[PDB]
Amino acid sequence: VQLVQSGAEVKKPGASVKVSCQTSGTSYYMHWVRQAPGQGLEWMGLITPSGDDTYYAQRFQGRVTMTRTSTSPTYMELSSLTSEDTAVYYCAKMSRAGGFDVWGQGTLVTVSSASTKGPSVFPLAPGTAALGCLVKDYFPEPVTVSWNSGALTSGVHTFPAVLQSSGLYSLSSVVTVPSSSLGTQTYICNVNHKPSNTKVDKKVEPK
Amino acid sequence: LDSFKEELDKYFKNH
Amino acid sequence: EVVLTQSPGTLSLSPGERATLSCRASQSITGRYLAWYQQKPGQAPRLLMYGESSRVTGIPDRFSGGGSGTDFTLTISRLEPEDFAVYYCQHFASSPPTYTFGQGTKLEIRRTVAAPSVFIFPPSDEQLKSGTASVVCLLNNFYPREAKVQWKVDNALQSGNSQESVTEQDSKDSTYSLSSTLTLSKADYEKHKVYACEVTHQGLSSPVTKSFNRGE
Numbered sequence: 051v052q053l054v055q056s057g058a059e060v061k062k063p064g065a066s067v068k069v070s071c072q073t074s075g076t077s078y079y080m081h082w083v084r085q086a087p088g089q090g091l092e093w094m095g096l097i098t099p100s101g102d103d104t105y106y107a108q109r110f111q112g113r114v115t116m117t118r119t120s121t122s123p124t125y126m127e128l129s130s131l132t133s134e135d136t137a138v139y140y141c142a143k144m145s146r147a148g149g150f151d152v153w154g155q156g157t158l159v160t161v162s163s164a165s166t167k168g169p170s171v172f173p174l175a176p177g178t179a180a181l182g183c184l185v186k187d188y189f190p191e192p193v194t195v196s197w198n199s200g201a202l203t204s205g206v207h208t209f210p211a212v213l214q215s216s217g218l219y220s221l222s223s224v225v226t227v228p229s230s231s232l233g234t235q236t237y238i239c240n241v242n243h244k245p246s247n248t249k250v251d252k253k254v255e256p257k
Numbered sequence: 258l259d260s261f262k263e264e265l266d267k268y269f270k271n272h
Numbered sequence: 273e274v275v276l277t278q279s280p281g282t283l284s285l286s287p288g289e290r291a292t293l294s295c296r297a298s299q300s301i302t303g304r305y306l307a308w309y310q311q312k313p314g315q316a317p318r319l320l321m322y323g324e325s326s327r328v329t330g331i332p333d334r335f336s337g338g339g340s341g342t343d344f345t346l347t348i349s350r351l352e353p354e355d356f357a358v359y360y361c362q363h364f365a366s367s368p369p370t371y372t373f374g375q376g377t378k379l380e381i382r383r384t385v386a387a388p389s390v391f392i393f394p395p396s397d398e399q400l401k402s403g404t405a406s407v408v409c410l411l412n413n414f415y416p417r418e419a420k421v422q423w424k425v426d427n428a429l430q431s432g433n434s435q436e437s438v439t440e441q442d443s444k445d446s447t448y449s450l451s452s453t454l455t456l457s458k459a460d461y462e463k464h465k466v467y468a469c470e471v472t473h474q475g476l477s478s479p480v481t482k483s484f485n486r487g488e
Contacts, residue, residue, distance in 0.1 A: 079265060091373040105368060145328075147261055148364045150362075153316035153318075170402070180391040186406065209449075264366035
């Protein structure tokens with residue numbers, strides 16, 4: 051059994067979100083668990099193998115709905131969203147012993163008054179030299195950063211994003227290289243922000 | 258000993 | 273409802289040593305209703321074991337556990353690199369159906385002290401055009417994770433205008449890296465000359481300061 055969930059979602063406060071979970075291909079009790087960025091795990095509820103009944107965590111009673119016909123994907127709908135609902139949502143299969151033995155890959159749901167926006171990318175200019183890219187003011191998560199289209203991987207550190215008081219995210223990506231290479235090599239950070247369909251390639255040169 | 262699934266089945270049969 | 277409290281918050285051990293992770297329940301339970309999970313960065317959790325040391329298929333012999341009543345333990349006897357992760361306990365009840373989780377224990381690699389290499393980056397001229405200046409201080413490849421970064425602008429200590437981010441522990445050298453970003457308006461930035469980040473760390477016999485003079 052492999053569990054495949056629907057893609058990431060972005061929502062404004064007060065809206066609802068509906069996430070799907072599909073058994074790739076016996077039915078089982080299915081549960082939902084969420085995890086806010088950097089926080090622990092929180093159970094939301096379960097639905098029976100047939101889909102004929104559910105039971106929810108107290109915190110979500112009145113706000114969440116879990117539905118399955120029989121061999122249809124199972125869905126979790128969460129209403130009256132607030133920014134506290136920003137989290138990765140997981141579906142999971144229960145074993146007969148009660149533990150969750152198979153998990154979906156997770157679905158990120160971001161709840162914010164902010165609107166989708168691609169990043170601005172700025173150079174962090176340089177026997178060891180450090181250089182980097184500042185990836186500022188985007189929404190929502192995530193961004194990916196590579197260096198030299200993946201040809202440069204050793205010594206790269208891409209930091210976890212921080213949420214700024216503006217409601218936009220920012221991160222930096224850095225790499226250390228030999229000081230001697232600064233004249234024979236060109237360094238470019240490749241930033242991809244799929245939520246906004248934006249890619250930025252920024253050359254980072256000694257100033 | 259009964260499995261947890263058996264416990265859950267019984268709960269939903271009677272509620 | 274049952275409440276689970278894990279301890280310690282962070283456990284720092286070297287490969288080959290024995291890890292003891294604790295989970296305490298707010299009321300007495302049978303360990304059949306407790307499960308342990310491992311979670312690594314970017315991944316869903318993975319079921320390991322039930323409270324009575326019963327492992328699920330594919331879990332190595334070095335994972336064991338024990339307990340009854342309120343106190344339960346997960347023991348990892350001869351730590352391997354792949355064992356360093358966050359661990360959660362979980363309790364379940366059927367009447368009415370209720371699951372809960374402990375808050376997690378981070379099991380991190382203890383290695384010898386390594387001092388950070390420190391770098392400071394001024395804002396780009398391009399960013400300044402937009403009205404904001406970000407100044408970045410990088411602390412690279414250090415251990416342990418605890419570090420102190422202070423910003424000084426014309427020798428005036430800054431407060432409230434910086435944010436830190438830390439990488440996950442490196443899979444090969446077991447170090448951390450950290451960024452501290454100072455954010456100023458363009459107008460505040462251009463009113464001052466010297467920008468400095470001062471770093472304190474277990475591996476440094478004296479704090480390290482990196483600085484630039486704005487416009488040199």
